[PDB]
Write a protein that binds this DNA or RNA. Structure first.
Ligand code: U5P
Ligand code: MG
Ligand code: MG
Ligand code: MG
Ligand code: MG
Ligand code: MG
Ligand code: MG
Ligand code: MG
Ligand code: MG
Lengths: 1635, 181
RNA sequence: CAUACUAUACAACCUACUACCUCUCU
RNA sequence: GAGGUAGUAGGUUGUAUAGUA
């Protein structure tokens, strides 16, 4: 990469040269030729779509069959050009004149047919792509076209004559008239050969190794080889004349040439391979005579093997090869022993020679101690098919892929290949190449030589006597052979092949002479680095001379280190487009060296270099200028390297930092705990009680607010769960109620509902319209009542909890109320006096006389509680009254049989005689013990009800007496609380818990409305807290069509290269003398191998002592100063461009809108119900959850941070913007923001069990009993201090937080609340309210305009913090309009945008949105490798925006589903719907690849095959070779969404409106069914039984295989480009087969 | 015994009424084991309270009741070599005679010698003379031997007897050289 | 890779309901 | 009312595997 820049791949180089002029592309492969033809068809269509011009593709394999050719599919699948290829016998139906078709594919005879009809005018055509013209017949067909249309047509009116002839070196015939053949070719078709291909651009821009031709010796033919040749000539004539009475000549012939050129031991080792192949083939013989023939061959190979083994193993491996082999392998071993990384690519001619060379190299490597560093692998050619005998095909596939893996990375050095190693296979950079055979043409000479790019490199060809027959005739064994059995022309071939090598060098000099861009010699670079290395460098840190340095060599090696390290894919090679140009000044020649940078780079102008005397000096100084401008604009650091992915530093002052609290900093810097921001770490937070409920107890004199708890039945309980058949008891009609006395006013709150034994009851709080002034005796009255209600009646008082009548926490009074008989409600003072009259009273075990005193009353036991006094004395169970029964008696029938009547039962069980027999009975049911009435008792949260009771058990429990509970009214004590008041009392704790939670959410809303003007501060009632409720064969043909353009090509570049058309000898003789005398022919008996003022004067001879002055070197600013003075002195520098016009012009010339914003000014903010829901964790087991608000809040977070990272950093690419987003979005950041702004303590994280998780009002926990492991004294010390008087007076036995005041909460759940509150603020108060909430939390994502406070601002324009010591607010403003990247470095960049955007109006009609700034559209389409884009950037960092826009659009639309998906059905309906495959499928379906601009070959092929397989599918969604997906096209689908976002003044509604017409029918199709993804389905339906394996590497080098292992069902494998696509297709084939 | 210790404690305490107090007081809601801890009381006015730990709340109640109760109380070359030994096990003196004597002499009748060698190593020969004529106008024959795998040798001559004799001499020197080791 | 959104299987725990057993209550 | 089941349904956390950007 050092001193030559980096070359473009040869396809676009040929594209640029054929853009420049007429060009005969001497390219072999038809696929690259078709890519090049496609690309100049669309570029000169863009030039042609101005006044109306047509470009033709006159062709020869077209117009006999009715099928479209490959170029028809290529050009109507992948462009918008309507091609009209001439079908056989066109009749031109109706009025269909040829003007309205862009490409107009034809036949040459057809082209003259409309040329003489004056239809296709030769002036009006813009391009004439004549196809393959290196053959005689096509030339004779083409001779009437250009013999008759050169004289009337001036070269001004003649279009470009692109002609895709074959590879020039294997073209036509002969060698003498080669140059005259090409000369007549260019003179006929009016062209110039511009062959710049991989044959050429390894010689030109890559290393050129010193090649060596070595003669070994002729094989002086010894006695062993004499005997072996005698035997083989004895059987050769016998095999020649075989017969049959009612193959083997090829395997008896080609064995002899191994003896002729490699020796007798190699003859043995090749006869073993032939013997194994013959015994493989001879068993399947169906013919008797052929069986005898193959037995003859196999036994002859046997006797040759045994003769050689007995020869050199009884009479006797380095010395063995030295004595019993040919000098050719001795020369090979000398060449290999001269070397001591080595990457060897020895070739061969036939597939058996490779294997005997394999045995030879292995034997020497395992025997000779010198060459122990030789790892040998080998390959053959490929002939057969998978259709016939797939066992051999799969075995060869698995062998060759392992061999190429072993050669690939570093293990195997010597790889003794065959003809499959030339095209196709990608291999490591070769060091020493040994062509064993002489090359057939120049193709096998430099598709083996012109691959070694390391340059300590040698390409050595061992040569010998040529392939000629050493046979003697049909004679039998000789007398000398009998004696051996019983006892025991270099110059001719070398002259002809040196003439052949001189012909190859004439070919390569011809190819270099046809190159457009000329190269200086390496002596010029040696002269430059020797002479002119005294120019001052660039040191941006110049005080220390050990760091920054850009010299002459480092500059030219430091632009290929910047352009490579850029955002690019595998379909993109990035490079700088250098141009030299010449001028003369003061009688010397100078070379201005213009550069250009990749459009990926933000150095978006040319660095027009300064002149130098040579060209390499111009190159090195222009790279100096490039490095200087690179660092001055800021792309380089102090080490003059590109900044890199991590190394980006933010510029806005709110960002960077990212410093947590020290309690979080210690863990994030120690790394030994569970990580913060994750659910693995836990922290205990205090349950913050409300502001209005802390220190609020009314005192004697202070008028306190009274708040009745108004309950109302809404949904009565259906009778299917009424297993006891009890009466429905609505609390609205109940005479006695409950109320709250407090001294801080409760705000307006949302009327929630609890689910009790009478159904759903809505709970509200209503004010008393007269204030209550509360005296001092009534203080201890209420203090008695609270202790009674929450200690005796409901029994919630724990041992670690005591009644503190002078308390701070939970400090609200509760009063028993009553309906006034005249109307209204008030406080029941008589009831509190009655309650105070009897305290914790022992129920009285009354004697017989009291029960004998009065009869039954049917008014005492209406609304009563009937606890029994004969059992459970200290605290009785409380029973309701359900039915009074006059049809039962104490003498009535017993349920069971073990006892008699109820009176008799009561005397026999205890001893209570009943003195009333005429009394009725009481059917009762128990009181509540699970006090949590928050959740519905009989319904899920999906809505579908749980099962109710069976009719048998319900009828039994409503009829049979063995169930139910029965009490006599004279042996039970009526509790003072009526049953209606007991039901209200038992539903009190859920009312108070939910009212505290709603007040906490109101507290958060109050805090943000105080801080950032976000909502009202204090006050209309809130909305209620509601809980929510074949063809496949026709497939192969299309794939075969793609492989068709490879298939014949291989044969077309293997054998034919035929059909010649119709000074050199002196150059051949000169090259012969040069190759024989210059040491490049190794002969057959040797071994292989100034003063600064005058230097400145000659350096710039175009005054110099003043600029030099006293110092040593010259500054670059001084250099451009003298050139600018020379410009001002001497008029103009009119320029000759020594060998671009490719880029030019710069160095030349109300249905759910997604962004609904409510008026944030004068807003109530969000409702505390949905802030409660966002504060409600999923562990709460409640009817509200944050988890559907977290997945919309997270997506809005990611979207808004992506947009702000796009607007501020208008020069950075996405590779570090994603790093900044991953900093600012991560759950560590959201957790530290939540812990900073008090969110661990505001959440609910447990099922509310009132016996364990609640402080009742005016109760106080000492907060020390949990860490500890009379009562009046305990009071008086628990207000003073805990630890000192405390000490003075199923593992981890130190057990954490007491349950009543704290709740354990993980970090990521606080991040979940952060995202959930972002979503809650989003839903209620718009996207702007969400943005201001994130600014409130700490992620600052909006601009700051610090303005002066305008004298009690009053309105408080929102997002404006409280003023500091000076009256200055910090009002947040809206997002800024970014910079349109129409980079005006061209004087007419608007007309250049209109020219390069030609014909996209079809795409605009295919999308609907007419762009107002089309540079965004061009930035979205342009690939990273579309180098003629001198107008904008590439598309990567805009796809970065579009992905986030699409993720938010999908997740906010799918959140709005009435089906109310889970978080998992919101992920899975998204992650199966924003995928690269489905994005690519809508891209192909809605015409995106038809307007995607790129200049990459591999992406063009991939896009072509995918559009073919999609167009055969109607655009619907061995080895498992499936079609790869164009990742570029899915990224175009994302980036067009991004460009529509940015071009529309940043609105998501226009993006959704445009993308609905593509995505939304398909969206309903996913939203009904269950799509998943092929790897996800194959691991879902097989939840454990699939196991995916480690990668294997194929033989090709750009293919990976996968091998799914579905256990005990089938092991399947598939291939693909990378791991992702290959794994997807292998699991897809497993899914498709296991159905 | 089949009664749980919760119900055992309830039965033991039912002799004087009494409603027990169960209160879950202490959960370690840790990262992978949620451990519960209840505490059992015995009235709030005069005189008992124990604690109980567990992994599940039913087991927590059980352990608390238990505490309260207790408180109350390659190879082809190997085939070639195996062929060499299964030709070697024919250890007759004819093989040594063919090894020691120079076989320039063609005076012997080779068909009886090859028959003796074939019967020596339990083989049998088969002659196939091709009836069709060569371009040189001479007879050609091929001889087949039931070896491992079966083998065919060659001979030709102006007569069919000459072809058979040439193939027989080929078989003779053939067996001579694979009796040389 | 990293970083958000997470899925399935398996394990533990909690919670709602339904039908039956043993005790208790009746 | 308490305890033991059995099933359905909700979750929560851990482990393993994996999707999508
Ligand atoms: O013991 C439970 C049950 O017998 C009683 N009960 C009675 C009547 C009715 O319609 N429903 C009902 O549940 O209530 C006792 C406790 O049940 P909850 O704890 O309130 O579910
Ligand atoms: Mg209950
Ligand atoms: Mg989750
Ligand atoms: Mg997030
Ligand atoms: Mg989250
Ligand atoms: Mg999950
Ligand atoms: Mg029960
Ligand atoms: Mg479930
Ligand atoms: Mg992606």
């Amino acid at each position: 990469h050092t001193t030559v820049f980096t070359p473009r791949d040869f396809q676009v180089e040929l594209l640029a040269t054929a853009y420049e002029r007429n060009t005969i592309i001497c390219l072999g492969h038809r696929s690259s030729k078709e890519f090049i033809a496609l690309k100049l068809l669309q570029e000169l269509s863009r030039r042609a779509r101005r006044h109306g011009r047509v470009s033709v593709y006159l062709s020869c394999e077209v117009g006999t069959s009715t099928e479209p050719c490959s170029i028809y599919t290529m050009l109507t699948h992948l462009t918008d050009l309507r091609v009209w290829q001439e079908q056989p016998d066109m009749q031109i139906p109706f009025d269909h004149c040829w003007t309205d078709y862009h490409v107009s594919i034809l036949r040459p005879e057809g082209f003259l047919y409309l040329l003489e009809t004056r239809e296709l005018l030769l002036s009006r055509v813009e391009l004439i792509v004549l196809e393959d013209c290196h053959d005689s017949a096509v030339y004779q067909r083409i001779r009437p076209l250009f013999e008759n249309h050169i004289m009337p047509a001036p070269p001004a009116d003649r279009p470009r004559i692109l002609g895709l002839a074959g590879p020039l070196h294997s073209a036509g015939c002969e060698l003498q008239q080669l140059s005259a053949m090409l000369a007549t070719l260019e003179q006929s078709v009016l062209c110039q050969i511009e062959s710049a291909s991989d044959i050429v651009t390894v010689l030109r821009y890559c290393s050129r190794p010193h090649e060596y031709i070595v003669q070994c010796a002729p094989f002086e033919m010894d006695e062993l080889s004499l005997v072996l040749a005698d035997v083989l000539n004895t059987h050769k004539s016998f095999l020649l004349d075989h017969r049959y009475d009612p193959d083997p000549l090829n395997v008896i012939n080609s064995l002899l040439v191994v003896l002729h050129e490699m020796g007798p031991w190699c003859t043995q080792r090749a006869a073993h391979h032939f013997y194994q192949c013959n015994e493989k083939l001879k068993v399947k013989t169906p013919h008797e005579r052929h069986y005898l023939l193959y037995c003859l061959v196999s036994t002859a190979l046997i006797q040759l093997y045994s003769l050689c083994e007995h020869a050199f193993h009884r009479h006797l491996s380095r010395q063995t090869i030295e004595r019993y082999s040919s000098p050719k392998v001795r020369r090979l071993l000398q060449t290999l022993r001269c070397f001591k990384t080595l990457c060897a690519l020895i070739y061969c001619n036939q597939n058996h020679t490779a294997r005997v060379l394999f045995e030879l190299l292995a034997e020497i490597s395992r025997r000779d101690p010198d060459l122990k560093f030789l790892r040998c692998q080998y390959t053959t050619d490929r002939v057969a098919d998978p259709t016939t005998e797939p066992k051999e095909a799969e075995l060869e596939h698995r062998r060759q892929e392992e061999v190429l893996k072993r050669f690939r990375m570093h293990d195997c050095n010597v790889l003794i290949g065959t003809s499959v190693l030339e095209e196709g296979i990608d291999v490591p950079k070769c060091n020493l190449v040994v062509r064993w055979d002489p090359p057939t043409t120049y193709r096998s000479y430099v598709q083996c030589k012109g691959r070694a790019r390391a340059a300590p490199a040698y390409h050595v060809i061992l040569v010998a006597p040529s392939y000629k027959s050493p046979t003697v005739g049909s004679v039998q064994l000789t007398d000398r052979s009998h004696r051996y059995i019983c006892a025991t022309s270099l110059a001719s071939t070398t002259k002809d092949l040196v003439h052949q090598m001189a012909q190859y060098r004439e070919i390569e000099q011809m190819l270099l002479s046809k190159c457009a861009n000329t190269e200086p010699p390496e002596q010029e670079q040696c002269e430059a680095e020797r002479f002119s290395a005294c120019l001052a460098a660039y040191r941006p840190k110049p005080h220390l001379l050990t760091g920054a340095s850009v010299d002459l060599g480092s500059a030219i090696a430091l632009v290929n280190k910047y352009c490579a390290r850029l955002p690019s894919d595998t379909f993109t090679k990035l490079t700088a487009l250098w141009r030299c140009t010449r001028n003369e000044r003061a009688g010397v020649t100078l070379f201005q060296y213009t550069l250009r940078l990749p459009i990926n780079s933000p150095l978006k102008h040319d660095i027009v270099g300064l002149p130098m005397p040579t060209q390499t000096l111009a190159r090195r100084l222009a790279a100096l200028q490039a490095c200087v401008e690179l660092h001055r604009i800021g792309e380089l650091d102090d080490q003059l390297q590109p900044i890199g992915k991590e190394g980006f530093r933010a510029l806005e002052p709110d960002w960077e930092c990212f410093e947590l609290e020290p309690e979080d900093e210690q863990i994030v810097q120690l790394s030994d705990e569970p990580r913060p921001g994750t659910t693995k770490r836990r922290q205990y937070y205090y349950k913050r009680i409300a502001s209005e409920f802390c220190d609020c107890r009314p005192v004697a004199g202070a008028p306190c607010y009274l708040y009745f708890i108004q309950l109302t039945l809404q949904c009565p309980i259906p009778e299917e769960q009424n297993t006891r058949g009890r009466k429905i008891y609505p609390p609205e009609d109940a005479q006695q109620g409950f109320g709250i006395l407090t001294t801080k006013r409760i705000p307006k709150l949302s009327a929630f509902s609890i689910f009790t034994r009478s159904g759903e009851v809505k709970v509200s709080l209503e004010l008393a319209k007269e204030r209550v002034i509360l005296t001092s005796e009534q203080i201890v009255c209420i203090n008695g009542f609270l202790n009674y209600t929450f200690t005796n009646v409901l029994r919630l008082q724990k041992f670690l909890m005591l009644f503190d009548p002078d308390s701070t926490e939970n400090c609200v009074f509760i009063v028993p109320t009553v309906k006034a008989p005249a109307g209204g409600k008030h406080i029941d003072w008589q009831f509190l006096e009655l309650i105070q009259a009897n305290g914790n009273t022992m129920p009285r075990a009354v004697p017989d006389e009291e029960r004998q005193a009065q009869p039954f009353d049917p008014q005492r036991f209406q609304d009563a509680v009937v606890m029994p006094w004969y059992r459970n004395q200290d605290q009785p169970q409380y029973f309701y009254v359900a039915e009074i029964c006059p049809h039962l008696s104490p003498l009535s029938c017993f349920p069971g049989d073990n006892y008699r009547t109820f009176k008799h039962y009561y005397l026999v069980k205890y001893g209570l005689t009943i003195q009333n027999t005429s009394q009725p009975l009481l059917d009762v049911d128990h009181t509540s013990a699970r006090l949590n009435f928050l959740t519905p008792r009989y319904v899920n949260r999906k809505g579908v009800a749980l099962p109710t009771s069976s009719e048998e058990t319900k009828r039994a429990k409503r009829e049979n007496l063995e169930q139910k509970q029965i009490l006599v009214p004279e042996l039970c004590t009526v509790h003072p609380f009526p049953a209606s008041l007991w039901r209200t009392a038992v539903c009190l704790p859920c009312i108070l818990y939910r009212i505290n939670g709603l007040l906490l959410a109101d507290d958060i809303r109050k805090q943000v409305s105080a801080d950032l003007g976000l909502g009202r501060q204090q006050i209309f009632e809130w909305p209620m807290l509601d809980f929510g409720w074949r063809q496949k064969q026709l497939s192969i043909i299309q794939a075969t069509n793609a492989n068709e353009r490879q298939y014949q090509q291989t044969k077309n570049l293997l054998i034919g290269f035929n059909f010649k058309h119709e000074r050199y000898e002196e150059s051949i003789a000169k090259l012969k003398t040069e190759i024989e005398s210059g040491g490049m022919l190794v002969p057959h008996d040797q071994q292989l191998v100034v003063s600064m003022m005058e230097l400145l004067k000659q350096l710039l001879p175009y005054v110099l002592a003043k600029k030099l002055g006293d110092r040593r070197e010259l500054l670059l600013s001084d250099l451009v100063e003298l050139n600018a003075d020379w410009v001002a002195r001497h008029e103009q520098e009119t320029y000759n461009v020594m060998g671009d016009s490719f880029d030019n012009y710069n160095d030349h010339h109300a249905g759910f809108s997604f962004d609904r914003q409510p008026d944030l000014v004068g807003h109530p903010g969000p409702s505390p119900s949905i802030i409660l829901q966002a504060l409600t964790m999923s562990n709460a087991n409640d009817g509200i959850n944050l988890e559907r608000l977290e997945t919309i809040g997270d997506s809005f977070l990611k979207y808004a941070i992506t947009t702000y990272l796009y607007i501020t950093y208008e020069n950075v690419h996405e590779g570090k913007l994603s790093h900044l987003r991953s900093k600012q979005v991560a759950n560590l950041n959201l957790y530290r923001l939540g812990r900073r702004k008090r969110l661990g303590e505001y959440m609910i994280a447990t099922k509310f069990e009132p016996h364990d998780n609640w402080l009742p009002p005016c109760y106080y926990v000492p907060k020390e009993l949990e860490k500890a492991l009379k009562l009046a004294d305990l009071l008086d010390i628990k207000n003073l201090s805990s630890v000192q008087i405390c000490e003075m007076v199923d593992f981890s036995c130190f057990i954490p937080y007491n349950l009543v005041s704290q709740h354990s909460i993980p970090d990521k759940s606080i991040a979940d609340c952060v995202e959930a509150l972002i979503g809650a603020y989003l839903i209620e108060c718009g996207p702007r309210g969400a943005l201001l909430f994130m600014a409130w939390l700490g992620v600052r994502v909006l601009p700051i305009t610090r303005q002066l406070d305008g004298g009690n601002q009053e309105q408080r324009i929102p997002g404006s913090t409280k003023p500091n010591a000076e009256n200055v607010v910090t009002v947040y403003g809206a997002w800024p309009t970014p910079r349109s990247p129409l980079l005006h470095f061209a004087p007419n960049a608007t007309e250049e945008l209109d020219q390069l955007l030609s014909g996209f109006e079809e795409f605009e009609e295919s999308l609907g949105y007419k762009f107002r700034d089309r540079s965004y559209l061009l930035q979205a389409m342009t690939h990273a490798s579309y180098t003629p884009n001198r107008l904008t950037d590439c598309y990567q960092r805009l796809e970065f925006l579009g992905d986030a826009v699409l993720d938010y659009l999908i997740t906010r639309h799918l959140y709005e589903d009435p089906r109310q998906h889970s978080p998992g059905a919101l992920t899975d309906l998204r992650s199966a719907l924003v995928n690269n495959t489905i994005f690519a499928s809508l891209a192909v379906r809605h015409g995106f690849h038809k307007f995607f601009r790129h200049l990459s070959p591999g992406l063009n092929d991939v896009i072509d095959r995918f559009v073919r397989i999609q167009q055969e599918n109607g655009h619907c969604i061995d080895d498992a070779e499936d079609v790869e997906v164009p990742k570029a096209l899915g990224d175009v689908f994302e980036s067009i969404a991004g460009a529509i976002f940015l071009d529309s003044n940043m609105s998501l509604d226009v993006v959704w409106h445009v993308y609905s017409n593509m995505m939304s029918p398909e969206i309903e199709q996913f939203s009904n069914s269950v799509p998943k993804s092929p790897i996800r389905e194959l691991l879902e339906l097989e939840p454990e039984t699939a196991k995916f394996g480690k990668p294997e590497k194929l033989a090709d080098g750009r293919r990976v295989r996968v091998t799914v292992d579905v256990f005990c069902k089938g092991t399947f494998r598939g291939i693909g480009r990378n791991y992702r696509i290959a794994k997807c297709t292998a699991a897809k084939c497993a899914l498709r087969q296991l159905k | 015994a089949m009664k749980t210790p919760v119900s055992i404690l309830q039965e033991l305490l039912s002799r004087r009424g009494i409603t027990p107090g169960y209160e879950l007081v202490q959960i370690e809601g840790a990262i992978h084991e949620p451990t519960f801890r209840f505490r059992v009381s015995f009235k709030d006015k005069d005189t008992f309270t124990a604690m109980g730990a567990g992994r599940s709340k039913k087991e927590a109640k059980h352990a608390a009741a238990r505490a309260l109760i207790d408180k109350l109380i390659t190879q082809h070359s190997n085939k070639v070599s195996q062929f060499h030994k299964t030709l070697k096990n024919a250890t007759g003196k004819k093989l040594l005679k063919l090894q020691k004597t120079c076989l320039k002499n063609n005076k012997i009748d080779y068909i009886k010698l090859l028959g003796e060698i074939a019967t020596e190593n339990q083989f049998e020969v088969t002659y196939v003379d091709i009836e069709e004529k060569t371009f040189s106008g001479q007879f050609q024959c091929l001889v087949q031997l039931s070896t491992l795998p079966v083998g065919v040798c060659h001979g030709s001559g102006p007569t069919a007897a000459d072809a058979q004799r040439h193939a027989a001499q080929n078989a003779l020197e053939y067996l001579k050289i694979m009796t040389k080791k």
